[PDB]
Amino acid sequence: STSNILNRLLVSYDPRIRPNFKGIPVDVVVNIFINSFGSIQETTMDYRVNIFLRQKWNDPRLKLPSDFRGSDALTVDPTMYKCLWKPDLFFANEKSANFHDVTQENILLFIFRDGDVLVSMRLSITLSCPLDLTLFPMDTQRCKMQLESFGYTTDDLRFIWQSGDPVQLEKIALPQFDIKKEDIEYGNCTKYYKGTGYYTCVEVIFTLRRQVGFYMMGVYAPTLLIVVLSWLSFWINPDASAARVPLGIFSVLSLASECTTLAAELPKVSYVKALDVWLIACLLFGFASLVEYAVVQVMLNTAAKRIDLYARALFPFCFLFFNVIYWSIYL
Amino acid sequence: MSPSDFLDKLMGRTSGYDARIRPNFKGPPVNVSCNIFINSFGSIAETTMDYRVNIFLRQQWNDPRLAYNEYPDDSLDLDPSMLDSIWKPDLFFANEKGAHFHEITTDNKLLRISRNGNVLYSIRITLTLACPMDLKNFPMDVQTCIMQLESFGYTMNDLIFEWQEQGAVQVADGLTLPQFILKEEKDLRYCTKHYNTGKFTCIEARFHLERQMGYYLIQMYIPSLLIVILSWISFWINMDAAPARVGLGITTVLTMTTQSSGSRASLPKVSYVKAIDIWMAVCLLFVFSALLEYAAVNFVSRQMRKLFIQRAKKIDKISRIGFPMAFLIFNMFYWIIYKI
Amino acid sequence: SPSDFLDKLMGRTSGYDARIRPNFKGPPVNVSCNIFINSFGSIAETTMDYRVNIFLRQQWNDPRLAYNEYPDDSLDLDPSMLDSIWKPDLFFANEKGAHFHEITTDNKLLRISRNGNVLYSIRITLTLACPMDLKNFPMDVQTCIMQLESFGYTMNDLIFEWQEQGAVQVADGLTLPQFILKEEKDLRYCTKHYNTGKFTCIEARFHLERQMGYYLIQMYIPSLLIVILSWISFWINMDAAPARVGLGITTVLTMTTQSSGSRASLPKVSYVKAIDIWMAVCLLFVFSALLEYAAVNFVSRQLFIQRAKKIDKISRIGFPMAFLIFNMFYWIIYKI
Amino acid sequence: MSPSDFLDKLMGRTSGYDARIRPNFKGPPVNVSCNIFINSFGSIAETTMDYRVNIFLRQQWNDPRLAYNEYPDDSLDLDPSMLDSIWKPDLFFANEKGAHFHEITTDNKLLRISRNGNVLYSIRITLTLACPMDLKNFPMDVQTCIMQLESFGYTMNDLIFEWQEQGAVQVADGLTLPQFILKEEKDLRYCTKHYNTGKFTCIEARFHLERQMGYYLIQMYIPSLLIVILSWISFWINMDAAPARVGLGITTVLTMTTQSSGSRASLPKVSYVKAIDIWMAVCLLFVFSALLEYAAVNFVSKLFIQRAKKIDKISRIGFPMAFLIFNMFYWIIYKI
Amino acid sequence: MSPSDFLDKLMGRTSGYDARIRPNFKGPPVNVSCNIFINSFGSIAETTMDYRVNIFLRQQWNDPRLAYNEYPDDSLDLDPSMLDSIWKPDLFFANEKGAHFHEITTDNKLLRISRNGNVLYSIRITLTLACPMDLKNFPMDVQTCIMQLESFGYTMNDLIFEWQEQGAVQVADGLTLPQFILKEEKDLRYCTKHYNTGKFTCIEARFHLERQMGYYLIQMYIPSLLIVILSWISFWINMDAAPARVGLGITTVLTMTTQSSGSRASLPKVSYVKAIDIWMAVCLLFVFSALLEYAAVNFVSRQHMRKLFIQRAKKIDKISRIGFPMAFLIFNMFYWIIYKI
Ligand SMILES: *[C@@H]1O[C@H](CO)[C@@H](O)[C@H](O)[C@H]1NC(C)=O
Ligand SMILES: *[C@@H]1O[C@H](CO)[C@@H](O)[C@H](O)[C@H]1NC(C)=O
Ligand SMILES: *[C@@H]1O[C@H](CO)[C@@H](O)[C@H](O)[C@H]1NC(C)=O
Ligand SMILES: *[C@@H]1O[C@H](CO)[C@@H](O)[C@H](O)[C@H]1NC(C)=O
Ligand SMILES: CCCCCCCCCCC
Ligand SMILES: CCCCCCCCCCC
Ligand SMILES: CCCCCCCCCCC
Ligand SMILES: CCCCCCCCCCC
Ligand SMILES: CCCCCCCCCCC
Ligand SMILES: CCCCCCCCCCC
Ligand SMILES: CCCCCCCCCC
Ligand SMILES: CCCCCCCCCC
Ligand SMILES: CCCCCCCCCC
Ligand SMILES: CCCCCCCCC
Ligand SMILES: CCCCCCCCC
Ligand SMILES: CCCCCCCCC
Ligand SMILES: CCCCCCCCC
Ligand SMILES: CCCCCCCC
Ligand SMILES: CCCCCCCC
Ligand SMILES: CCCCCCC
Ligand SMILES: CCCCCCC
Ligand SMILES: CCCCCCC
Ligand SMILES: CCCCCCC
Ligand SMILES: CCCCCCC
Ligand SMILES: CCCCCCC
Ligand SMILES: CCCCCC
Ligand SMILES: CCCCCC
Ligand SMILES: CCCCCC
Ligand SMILES: CCCCCC
Ligand SMILES: CCCCCC
Ligand SMILES: CCCCCC
Ligand SMILES: CCCCCC
Ligand SMILES: CCCCCC
Ligand SMILES: CCCCCC
Ligand SMILES: CCCCCC
Ligand SMILES: CCCCCC
Ligand SMILES: CCCCCC
Ligand SMILES: CCCCCC
């Protein structure tokens, strides 16, 4: 009849035996369709991808009978994969992954004439990638996606990327990142857990380049404005303490508060980053401005005009020199 | 005519109904007319670019092997404990970003088999959909968030989705939202996907969402206007009060910096320039230029000795009469642009 | 035997099809409901929702469940068998998320009476959603409701009604932070008219008043202190221009910080709240104090001393009365 | 002998053990002696007024139809994967506010059927219980948080709950907490409640939690004493000048306000006044009163100079004594 | 012959294998050798005092009634779908504080029955264990967070847990942690519990975790040092600038108060005094003393036809100016030498 073909195929078909039980390992090809790439969270060293994971192997026990109509493809319901052997492909970077069943369990299953199967189930994997926060506002992170088997050694199961396009993203447009080209290198990733054997592994590496725009609008402009404010504080030179000290005080305090606030979000990594270097240098320039005013006061309490003229001449030059060096080094 | 016998005869053991083959198998694809009902909208997060909708998805296909002749009724009602033994479409929201059913005191499914073969099916889902936002005109944007109904198990030639002709997207009567206000017209386009494994079906609805201007306007424009007027009254003070003018300028600069930092902190770390960012930058620039022109006047007054004081007072008067005019010009120029 | 009685009443040797309503092809079976609020609380403002831990009960009439062996009238049963009985499928129209409770066993109760009445009491935990009106935010009177509503049948097949006496019971020790629950609880009707037919619905209203103590103290006393600080800023020598302008500065900064905190503690609603007006008026008073001092300085710098002192004195004797009259009007309008 | 056959005969398919009817049916009720074992207490969330406990709830009733004579052993241990086919008590926590089992590598249950019929049952739950808290003496409070074990399906006439006679509530030896400390003596009373549907048995245990002063004491009181000493030193300046007196004073008030905001940011929106609030307000009042005194002295300021200096001296001598009297009175009030 | 027949004969319908009785029933207890494989640490929170670990628990007991002889292979591999029908140990973590399995595209179990009867069993767990921390030397502390494998359903005389002799706790190759850095030596003590019901076996491993000082050092010591130098440059000014110096002192005192308040935002409300609270208190005290000495100098200068008051005020200013920095250096040396040993 209609379903009698699949009933005949699955009768006497033990789902607890892999294809070619005593023969060669089954070659499973893997294809990934990134439906939506999520936002990477620097706080917890992780991001949330949403993929249409696809697998395709050869099962000789599932050859379609010669009485089957239709050219090649025999699609079945999503509620029938329970009776078919499936590779135990799991993600080695997952933190808390999830299935997807909004109306029915989202799993597709094609069967061809030669016995090939195609499971294209949908996942919501939440990977974790260790970031490198050196050169923080201008960095290019590489976040991975490791797929590997669990219960079968290399003698039984192995994963090979599809010869076409293993990744088929079309439009992503991350809020603060942009991915253009990625490498599928380390194709082979086979791990060797001690005393257990060789386990197949495949790996995809992305290149999450970070856009500078927000940070160039976030700290660069306010900090430059405060430094120029300190410069014009040099400019007046009224020798009035109540009008000259508060400018340097406000510059130093604003730099300190801005640094603390902007660093209160990133993960507590322990090494100097570009943002910290910039903040420290600008805060040091403000403090040096205040020390310059102090030395003017002590020398005036050879004249203060000469030293003030020298300062007004040299601090803008020194700041421009530092800015050029910083941008050239970090770009 | 016992109800127990009739249900078993129509589906189950003594029926011959295989709930694994689609209606009209090996033939034309089966249409699935869909019509959602927005029970409760809202929870429009900005950071995660997602909104939570509580729909009531309905769909009615045509299964020819479910027709009955015993009961004279046409709109026969069935059990939410029975529809697990009949074939159903498997539409999934392509941007669901997480979803869950609802089960309180019983499941939340409705089944209604018609006389000819039409089968109504209405479940209650609570999606948390994802829609990318364009925050260029952030305080006055008109967002467009969408949902994409689409199956997962069949090909284009096996299962057709269409919207209902009349009244496809209904809305709860007393629905209201914070901030945004939901429009009346809802576009119903086609979103048919071409994946690597064949052409698949995709029907989508568009909800056009405006943004109310009250909270943003008040809480991030009135303080800015007040601080700018404070800078102007800093202009309108004695020239000799150097510490007073310096302190007032410093306070205005600090207030603008803090307000800009606070305004930037409620939105995702987007790259481009927003609409409120231009306003905050211009206000900060005006405050800084005000303090800088005070600094220039103070420098000029120091370095004909009497002529320098006269020109310093002239510059101060020109500033006090011109700045406010320039700010008014900027205000009109800005408001006329972001309202068109 | 008790096992044989249960088997013949329900299950294998019973013939009870647990899929057909009682009184089929006839009048609808009314289901009398009565909740019992075990523990209220967790009224969040940002998410515009509250959590209630109800002890829902309902008792319909099933004619095909009568028994004659036991002389007892209220025969109690095992919560592991009430899954083989037709049950109403009521759902909360604004549940926004809910779950059962299963600790050490399920948390259901079944009790079949002699004539056929069947009690059914489960312990659910809802997090219901209620739209709020924050116009009079420090002194608002919320009205958050729950809507019991059927989903399976049309009105002609299932009707929901409340009990005549004690429909909504409240735990004796039920206490809340901030809000205090009223005593009267309205029991209205919410008959829905969907596109698929009429579905029965019953709703209960909880009148929730808000205690004014914490809000009063925290965001009213500092405002009065800052206003009095500006008033004593009037009470200082005219020559102390830097001191007066700095004190005006710190008053303005304190008002700005407090306004930012108050606006950030609440959801970003479009309209103006009752406390935002207070903050705005206090900030306007402080800003006008700074403005009038600058005006006095300008007049004095340009007989001028006498008129400047007269302006200062009239300001010092005039703003306190204006603030008092504003306070009286505000409190009389927002307490009626 | 076949243990499989013995188990099947005792219960299961070929046993006739209907696991849906209470032991001693239509007869006397069965006591369920309970004795918990707190593995890990803590997480005293003050904002949400709840705490998390990880108990090892145990209970042992008497089932006459489980008596066996085949095996010679008495304390026969069973498999935690097959105890779902016997009668089990259905106690629930009346204020659980959500709870879940633990299933790691296997279920976390234990079963032990004695020879006479005693059946041990020890599951591993993780509750997050709810206890209303009273914060009148906020830093020196003695909280009382409780857990209410209570049955759900059966009536008081069909069931009795009792605690174990000796060592009812055991505590892990290495248990420790931040902030609070768990007392050794615990109260175990009865909570037999009368719902609308009948009397349900209930047993509750009381946990007494003191509060360590260490963090609060230091970080909320030592800065206050330092600022008060600073204000006294501000008194100890001569005619000096504006900054000497005003400045010292201007910092003092500014820091004591910072102290205010700090003591404020960590508690729920409670209405009545806390205990730390009284101290913080009095410290702010002393700073403000010192500033007001300084002002009045400045307003007064050769005979007027003499009286102003005498007022300053009597202030510098009297204010420390008044502060000491207030401190002693406050501490005696809050330490009795 | 038939693999399906072999599987059914070994366990299932035609087997007689009851998966409810422990191996060596009514005999010696069955030892279960355990060895975890830490895949990744992370999320070592201070607020809740817990750390999330993604372990790869393995164990191997001896089941006599699983022996086979027809197949020549010794390390016969089975599926993670049919291991539910065999007896398994029920070890639980005494301080798991919540945990869950991993189920993606399948389960994440493994079954490997050896020739003699040894049965490997390697599931993938994601624990969030609870470890009470000691924050005395908070920026320079060394933690010791532990996990305790322990059986619950059986008795010490019916189930004993032991670690493998060689390679008991493996570590992922490229494993790294933010903040903390993991040591190499890990202790393996014993944990035999004595509950009310009797003796239950338990075995624990200790992970020694040091803390990196980079982030804390930079962004909670550099601002304090800079503010102290700010007080010093306030010292380095003439005494006529009374409003300027008093304003700077006010700002610095407020800054130290705010920084000390922001110190405790990310730490639990622990009772005793920490390591860095002493540093913050000393910095606040130094700023406070700077303002205090300015007040004293103003008092001395204004106490005044003699210039001796001005001369002694200038001497006081100079001696404090040259002395404070030395006192700060002495305090810094003492603090570092006593908190780095
Ligand atoms: C990967 O290396 C492993 C280990 O030698 C080997 O078994 C396997 O053939 C290799 N596979 C690929 C894809 O190169
Ligand atoms: C709708 O159903 C009919 C009958 O099965 C089919 O012929 C038609 O192709 C389907 N929809 C479309 C327009 O493809
Ligand atoms: C304890 O259990 C027995 C069982 O028959 C019952 O009669 C008695 O009332 C229960 N309560 C007491 C007194 O412990
Ligand atoms: C487990 O080791 C103990 C200790 O020697 C021993 O009694 C027992 O024989 C071992 N396991 C077996 C084989 O039952
Ligand atoms: C997307 C380019 C942004 C360039 C920098 C803009 C700075 C604006 C603010 C200047 C004070
Ligand atoms: C209904 C529109 C309301 C717009 C905001 C009005 C604010 C008025 C007060 C400003 C201080
Ligand atoms: C962990 C190494 C610490 C080295 C000493 C740092 C001293 C910093 C303060 C210098 C004044
Ligand atoms: C983790 C290495 C830290 C090296 C010292 C950094 C010092 C930065 C501040 C310099 C003023
Ligand atoms: C790990 C090396 C640290 C060197 C000393 C750094 C000092 C930075 C602060 C200088 C004021
Ligand atoms: C002022 C000196 C600060 C650095 C002291 C370093 C002491 C030795 C540390 C060895 C780990
Ligand atoms: C790349 C080395 C950075 C060293 C610390 C920062 C130095 C700042 C100098 C202005
Ligand atoms: C470990 C004992 C702590 C006692 C309270 C805090 C004392 C602080 C002294 C500076
Ligand atoms: C308004 C709160 C009064 C609390 C009791 C009295 C406190 C006296 C402190 C000196
Ligand atoms: C929604 C229109 C707002 C217009 C504001 C104009 C403000 C002019 C100062
Ligand atoms: C056990 C703590 C004692 C704290 C004494 C503080 C004394 C301050 C003057
Ligand atoms: C902290 C800055 C001290 C600057 C001293 C300058 C001395 C010049 C002779
Ligand atoms: C137990 C910690 C003692 C810290 C003493 C610090 C002394 C600094 C002078
Ligand atoms: C991609 C933008 C870089 C801008 C560098 C700074 C130019 C002044
Ligand atoms: C202000 C100088 C910016 C230089 C950017 C780098 C150019 C190669
Ligand atoms: C905004 C300042 C106005 C001053 C007017 C003085 C007459
Ligand atoms: C003064 C600018 C008015 C703009 C009105 C836009 C509707
Ligand atoms: C879109 C850019 C608008 C600039 C306006 C400047 C007044
Ligand atoms: C009901 C609260 C009244 C407060 C009055 C404050 C002056
Ligand atoms: C009912 C409250 C009246 C307050 C009046 C305040 C003047
Ligand atoms: C209890 C230890 C106190 C140390 C104080 C150091 C200043
Ligand atoms: C720190 C800058 C000093 C400049 C002296 C001319
Ligand atoms: C800010 C620019 C200053 C230039 C002085 C020659
Ligand atoms: C896009 C550039 C905007 C500049 C505003 C001053
Ligand atoms: C702010 C502009 C000042 C120009 C002085 C000549
Ligand atoms: C601030 C610039 C001043 C220029 C004087 C000629
Ligand atoms: C905004 C330009 C102001 C110019 C004043 C002279
Ligand atoms: C608000 C505009 C004021 C202008 C004064 C000259
Ligand atoms: C009952 C509230 C009292 C508040 C006193 C400031
Ligand atoms: C409803 C508006 C009230 C305004 C009081 C000043
Ligand atoms: C127990 C605390 C005493 C504090 C005395 C000032
Ligand atoms: C200052 C007196 C404290 C007394 C504590 C019992
Ligand atoms: C004055 C009361 C003293 C109490 C000592 C225990
Ligand atoms: C803390 C510094 C004291 C200096 C005394 C001369």
Curated annotation (Swiss-Prot), chain A:
Q: Which residues bind glycine 2?
A: 196
List, in alphabetical order, the GO biological process terms annotated in this UniProt record. Answer: acrosome reaction; adult walking behavior; chemical synaptic transmission; chloride transmembrane transport; gamma-aminobutyric acid receptor clustering; monoatomic ion transport; nervous system development; neuropeptide signaling pathway
Q: In the UniProt record, does the keyword NADP occur?
A: no
Residues included from the entire protein: 55 to 355 of 497
**Disulfide bond annotation, renumbered to this chain:** 129-143, 189-201
Q: How does it assemble?
A: Forms heteropentamers with glycin receptor alpha subunits. Heteropentamers with GLRA1 can be composed of two GLRA1 and three GLRB subunits, or three GLRA1 and two GLRB subunits, or four GLRA1 subunits and one GLRB subunit. Forms heteropentamers with GLRA2. Functional GLRB-GLRA2 heteropentamers contain four GLRA2 subunits and one GLRB subunit, although alternative subunit composition cannot be excluded. Forms a heteropentamer with GLRA3. Interacts with GPHN.
Q: Which organism is it from?
A: Homo sapiens (Human)
Quote the protein name from its UniProt record. Glycine receptor subunit beta
Q: List the residue ranges forming a coiled coil, or say none.
A: none
Per the record, the gene is GLRB
Q: What is its main location?
A: membrane
Choose one Gene Ontology CC annotation of this protein and give it. Answer: glycine-gated chloride channel complex
Where does it localize? Answer: Postsynaptic cell membrane; Synapse; Cell projection, Dendrite; Cell membrane
Site Important for obstruction of the ion pore in the closed conformation: which residues? 253
Curated annotation (Swiss-Prot), chain C:
Coarse class of the protein's main subcellular location: membrane
So which domain of life are we looking at?
A: Eukaryota
Q: Provide the function of this protein.
A: Subunit of heteromeric glycine-gated chloride channels. Plays an important role in the down-regulation of neuronal excitability. Contributes to the generation of inhibitory postsynaptic currents. Channel activity is potentiated by ethanol. Potentiation of channel activity by intoxicating levels of ethanol contribute to the sedative effects of ethanol.
What is this protein called in UniProt? Answer: Glycine receptor subunit alpha-1
The residues that hold strychnine are 194-199
Entries under NCBIfam families matching the protein: LIC
Lineage, broadest ranks: Eukaryota, Metazoa, Chordata, Craniata, Vertebrata
Q: Implicated in which disease? A: Hyperekplexia 1: A neurologic disorder characterized by muscular rigidity of central nervous system origin, particularly in the neonatal period, and by an exaggerated startle response to unexpected acoustic or tactile stimuli.
Q: What is the effect of changing residue 263 to L?
A: In HKPX1; requires much higher glycine levels for channel activation
User: Any ranges marked Cytoplasmic in the topology annotation, and which?
Assistant: 237-241
Where does this protein hold glycine 1? Answer: 57, 121
**Other remarks?**
The alpha subunit binds strychnine.
State the SUPFAM superfamilies in the record: Neurotransmitter-gated ion-channel transmembrane pore, Nicotinic receptor ligand binding domain-like
Activity control summary: Channel opening is triggered by extracellular glycine. Channel characteristics depend on the subunit composition; heteropentameric channels are activated by lower glycine levels and display faster desensitization. Channel opening is also triggered by taurine and beta-alanine. Channel activity is potentiated by nanomolar concentrations of Zn(2+); half-maximal activation is observed with 37 nM Zn(2+). Inhibited by higher Zn(2+) levels; haf-maximal inhibition occurs at 20 uM Zn(2+). Inhibited by strychnine.
- Give me the disulphide-bonded residues: 130-144, 190-201
Output the PANTHER family linked to this UniProt entry. Answer: NEUROTRANSMITTER GATED ION CHANNEL
Q: Which organism is it from?
A: Homo sapiens (Human)
Curated annotation (Swiss-Prot), chain D:
- Describe how its activity is regulated: Channel opening is triggered by extracellular glycine. Channel characteristics depend on the subunit composition; heteropentameric channels are activated by lower glycine levels and display faster desensitization. Channel opening is also triggered by taurine and beta-alanine. Channel activity is potentiated by nanomolar concentrations of Zn(2+); half-maximal activation is observed with 37 nM Zn(2+). Inhibited by higher Zn(2+) levels; haf-maximal inhibition occurs at 20 uM Zn(2+). Inhibited by strychnine.
Which residues are listed for strychnine binding in this entry? 195-200
Cytoplasmic compartment spans: 238-242
Q: Which residues are glycosylated?
A: 31
A GO BP term here is: cellular response to amino acid stimulus
Look up keyword Membrane and say if it applies: yes
Q: What is the effect of changing residue 273 to M?
A: In HKPX1; high leak currents in the absence of glycine due to spontaneous channel opening
Mark the transmembrane ranges.
Answer: 216-237, 243-263, 275-295, 314-334
Q: Which InterPro entries match?
A: GABAA/Glycine_rcpt, Glycine_rcpt_A, Glycine_rcpt_A1, Neur_chan_lig-bd, Neur_chan_lig-bd_sf, Neur_channel, Neuro-gated_channel_TM_sf, Neuro_actylchol_rec
Q: Ranges in the Extracellular compartment?
A: 1-215, 264-274
Task: Tell me what happens on changing residue 223 to S.
Answer: In HKPX1; impairs expression at the cell membrane; requires much higher glycine levels for channel activation
The entry's localization annotation reads: Postsynaptic cell membrane; Synapse; Perikaryon; Cell projection, Dendrite
So where does glycine 1 get bound? 58, 122
Membrane topology designation = Multi-pass membrane protein
Which Cys residues form disulphide pairs? 131-145, 191-202
Q: Which reaction does it catalyse?
A: chloride(in) = chloride(out)
Q: What is this protein called?
A: Glycine receptor subunit alpha-1
Q: Which organism is it from?
A: Homo sapiens
Gene name per UniProt: GLRA1
